[PDB]
Amino acid sequence: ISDARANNAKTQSQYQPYKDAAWGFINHWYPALFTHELEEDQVQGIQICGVPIVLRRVNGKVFALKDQCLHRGVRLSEKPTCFTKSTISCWYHGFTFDLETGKLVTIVANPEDKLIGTTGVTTYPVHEVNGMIFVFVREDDFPDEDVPPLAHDLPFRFPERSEQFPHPLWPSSPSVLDDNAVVHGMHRTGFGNWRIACENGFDNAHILVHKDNTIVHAMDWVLPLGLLPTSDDCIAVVEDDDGPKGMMQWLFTDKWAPVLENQELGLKVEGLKGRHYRTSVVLPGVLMVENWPEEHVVQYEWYVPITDDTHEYWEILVRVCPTDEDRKKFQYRYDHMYKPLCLHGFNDSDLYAREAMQNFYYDGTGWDDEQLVATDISPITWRKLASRWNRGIAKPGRGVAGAVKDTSLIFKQTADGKRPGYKVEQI
Amino acid sequence: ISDARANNAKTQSQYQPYKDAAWGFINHWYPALFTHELEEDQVQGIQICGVPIVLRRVNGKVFALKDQCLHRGVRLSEKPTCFTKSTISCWYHGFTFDLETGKLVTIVANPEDKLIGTTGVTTYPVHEVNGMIFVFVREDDFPDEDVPPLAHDLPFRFPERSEQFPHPLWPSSPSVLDDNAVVHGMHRTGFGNWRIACENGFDNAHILVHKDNTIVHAMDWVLPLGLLPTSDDCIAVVEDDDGPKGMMQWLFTDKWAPVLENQELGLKVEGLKGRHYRTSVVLPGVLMVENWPEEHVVQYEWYVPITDDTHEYWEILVRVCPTDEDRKKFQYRYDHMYKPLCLHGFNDSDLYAREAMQNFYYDGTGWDDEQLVATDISPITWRKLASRWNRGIAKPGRGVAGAVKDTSLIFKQTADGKRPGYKVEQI
Amino acid sequence: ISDARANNAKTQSQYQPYKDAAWGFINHWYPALFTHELEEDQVQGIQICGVPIVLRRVNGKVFALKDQCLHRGVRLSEKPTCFTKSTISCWYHGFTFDLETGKLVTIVANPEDKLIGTTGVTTYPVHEVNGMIFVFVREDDFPDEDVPPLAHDLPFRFPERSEQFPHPLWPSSPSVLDDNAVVHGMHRTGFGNWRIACENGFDNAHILVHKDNTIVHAMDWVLPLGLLPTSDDCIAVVEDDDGPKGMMQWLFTDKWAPVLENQELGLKVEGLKGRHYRTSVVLPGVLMVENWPEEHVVQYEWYVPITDDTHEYWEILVRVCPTDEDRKKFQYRYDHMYKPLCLHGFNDSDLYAREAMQNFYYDGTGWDDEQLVATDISPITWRKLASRWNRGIAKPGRGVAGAVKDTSLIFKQTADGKRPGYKVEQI
Numbered sequence A, B, C: 001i002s003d004a005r006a007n008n009a010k011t012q013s014q015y016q017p018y019k020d021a022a023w024g025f026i027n028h029w030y031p032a033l034f035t036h037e038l039e040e041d042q043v044q045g046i047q048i049c050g051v052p053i054v055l056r057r058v059n060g061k062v063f064a065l066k067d068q069c070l071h072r073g074v075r076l077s078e079k080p081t082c083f084t085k086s087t088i089s090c091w092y093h094g095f096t097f098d099l100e101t102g103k104l105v106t107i108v109a110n111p112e113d114k115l116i117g118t119t120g121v122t123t124y125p126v127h128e129v130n131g132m133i134f135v136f137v138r139e140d141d142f143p144d145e146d147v148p149p150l151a152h153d154l155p156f157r158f159p160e161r162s163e164q165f166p167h168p169l170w171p172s173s174p175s176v177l178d179d180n181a182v183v184h185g186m187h188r189t190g191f192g193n194w195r196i197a198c199e200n201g202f203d204n205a206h207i208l209v210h211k212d213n214t215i216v217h218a219m220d221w222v223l224p225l226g227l228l229p230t231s232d233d234c235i236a237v238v239e240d241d242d243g244p245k246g247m248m249q250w251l252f253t254d255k256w257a258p259v260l261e262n263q264e265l266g267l268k269v270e271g272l273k274g275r276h277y278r279t280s281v282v283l284p285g286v287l288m289v290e291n292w293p294e295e296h297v298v299q300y301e302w303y304v305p306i307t308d309d310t311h312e313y314w315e316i317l318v319r320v321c322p323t324d325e326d327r328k329k330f331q332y333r334y335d336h337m338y339k340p341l342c343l344h345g346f347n348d349s350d351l352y353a354r355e356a357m358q359n360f361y362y363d364g365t366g367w368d369d370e371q372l373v374a375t376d377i378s379p380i381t382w383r384k385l386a387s388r389w390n391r392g393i394a395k396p397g398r399g400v401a402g403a404v405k406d407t408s409l410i411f412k413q414t415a416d417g418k419r420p421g422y423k424v425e426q427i
Ligand SMILES: O=c1ccc2ccccc2[nH]1
Pocket: A201, A202, A203, A204, A207, A277, A279, A289, A292, A299
């Protein structure tokens, strides 16, 4: 281990809370499911930050409660059982909970038990918008009064912040919160800790991983070998009370110099199609790639912690489409261009890159022995701000799926060919 | 956690040994194999309470020894090697053991070694009766003269105890010990701890899990949403020296009131076919369901600990059949009725219910955080008596399969598609 | 546990370092790949003694470096990326290393970083000969000038040592080092610790495992039930500075008496075709079977530790073939005789025998509780000499594949049907 590495002792001491957040940052908004994954009267179980959650849509509205019956701890989502529009029951011994408050309102065949009304399961705020269902995953005692607006946990918005983050080379990127904003994308389970997956996206030295991607050569893009920071303010850290907590990288300004060649190794980025974009990341770990893959379109990614060694990777493209005609155009371009060449192809390379790095960090070795360099100003800056502004460090799961990694149940599922997942299998 | 739960500190302190028996209660009788699973000269390896056991039938008689060669620990049952009617040898280096005493009588190519005769492997008492092979799984130092009769670890017998446990609504249930008693059923590995699986069977609130079983609607049975205890003596605890240690639930008396409806949730048990039955459980955890699924027929279930997170679930129906004609009638009704609709269909629901609860308890969380209620007087009573009368608590396996859950051998088998099991695979 | 066992307290205290070497003996030569597994410009990743290693052949020469980018710990071998004949780069962020020295010579898109030239990855000496690529697996601080010749970690050579180890009953066995020596064989991943796999080969009581092998009856050989030591010097321990450290068993002399029958168990070796051979073993655990399976042919086996519970089992036959005609004859006899009946068939029995013994030892039980006898003078003598002469005890892997056994990546691969392995899968 060399003394020339950027992550010296002083630096590492500045992001200890981050090193301690293997299970994720709790008391934050996270995408749970796409709207199309939860239809009227549909019940679905998931897990975020080690917390089991069950969702149900009733009369168009989505509710989220802890997917754990307080009687004997079974998941309520395994065999959806709802007798009324305002409740959800446990299919085992009948404990029934209020969808709105989570209170134990009754027990199917024991309506007079003294336990009734004296407790309940945790509820989770829901915010559904433009095809996406967001859930505020919180600790059992986090007060309702303290739940912040979804926007505080989403990337910086434009044109609102165009003055703060000038972007003369491209039109303003839309937000999932914008009217008529349309979302196209997917989410799949990633194998490995969320942090390692998250740091990949806004790292300007990692773009080497895409040197051979088909889209790069089909579009004849000008994708440099990497970018280099030229000043100490190459990244702007934002931490104002009202608004997202994160950072903006001044890409395509002199603060980040592109490297298009290395004669010594025989490398040279040949391409004439200019490709302008800009990355930023905000808690709980949301990436925004402005002007990607084309003008008026933006890419957002999430790395939702499921357990301490699995995460749900979200990848979406957003574009404001005011007319039916605009939507069809976007849908078409997504189907025959973006999805196959970008979300798949371009980003698939990131999938394996993130995985390949997991073994170094899981047992703690990497958090101490990694030897960072100049370009690592990005992940380091993120780790420090995340350590400073997270709303809580999730505790390890106890008495829930994932609390123990080598159960006979997990070996049974694995034997059957089922990989670690996210959405609870029913029946 | 509410203070209104039935399992308060005082109550929990009364079943600590039960909480400590994840690997099972040792020094007890357990069903090992059905007679048809061990033919003349056949050798089979199994595991109970973490103890590897090998069985061989010679001249019609079944013998059981520890399935662990004392030389270098291989399982004798993996490659059956018996050179004489009175012994069993290890296929690796030839250590040979007397079937009757387990003593090391010789070594194939080293007959004069000083180790010979100075030690041996543990032997286990066997009691085969009416199609079932029972084995007394005991500690290495449990004395032969202390081995109790099989009947002490089997459900209460009728008509013998008809006066003690009056049953005016149905004829006496036969015992596996009765003359001409015929057994039909099966056993299969269950994924999860034996205790959690065992408590499901005699829980009168869990019957909600069967509300949709085909047999219930085909027979138009009257299966209530659940039963409620009406008095403190709704369960009779029996603990007399000579006889089984367990409890009898006074089902179909005032002590247990049926709940056939819940207007508030829109539920109502419609059915005119009366279905009378009664459950009881005795150590080491044997369920008896009198008058099920029909008069003169009784169901017995075992949840045999294999390791601390797997068990062998036994499900059988018994009926005394004095004539060849009687046997054919029973075999036919089993084949085209009981098996498809009862053992499967009805009880398959229990399979998944038991599994769904395991995650809450494995790491210990559930044993402390569960919030039991009135109907839980059943499991609680069982836990207490089990704690007071068990003949020993099995120690974790050491140097045997299952001692370590994440070995490369297990990952190899899992990769090959093999689930955790019970019967040792040979060759 | 009997007091008549050969492994008494005093004896066990003499091989404690061996009990401590679950991850293998480091600073030793091990076979890595066959020459045919690494062609010109080919890159391959493996793991030995818990150390990740990547090899590349350039201009006919093979180089070996630690398969771990010092930047953020990914394996360099997962996506081979070499820009010049003298280097290998990390496909993720461009760190580039010198094949010869392992020094960090540059970073693709950050050629001026101060970290460059101040560190590098470990290099491993390579010795390719007659179709086999040997690698000297060493600790990061083991001096180049201290690397010993390959011959020191290979079995004793003949005729060089024919006087020291007289063999009147068969011609001298060739070495892999001999000119015109031809190698035919294979290596496959073994499931279980390397030590337990290794001790099987030179155990003269284990041959009982082959009593039913097809080759034995087709050749009508004379394979005794086992051999017995008759004197204290039945094994010669060699530990001279210049040369291999190991032991030679005086098979086919009066020091080892064959046992061809056991009337008491009805066993009798009925064979008239004499089969003369001799076994020896040297650090790091290399077996030599002289005159096997025929004259002028010798069998060598390795049990290379990968992790502490997996090893790469090597099985090869060597014969000196001076002419093209000789090579074809050897190839033909290997293809239609040795491979199907010897490497497979005869030795496949050992595969499962070794596996069946692993559970007893992994958690440490077997190393203390095994009850060894007279014939175990072989494994005991080996354990003592290994404890005394090993060049180092490998430390458990940290931050590398195998450091943690139950990662989600491992369950993902297992679910996909992939068994624990050795060669790193690419792309
Ligand atoms: O640095 C970068 C460059 C391109 C890119 C594209 C999609 C997602 C994240 C990305 N990050």
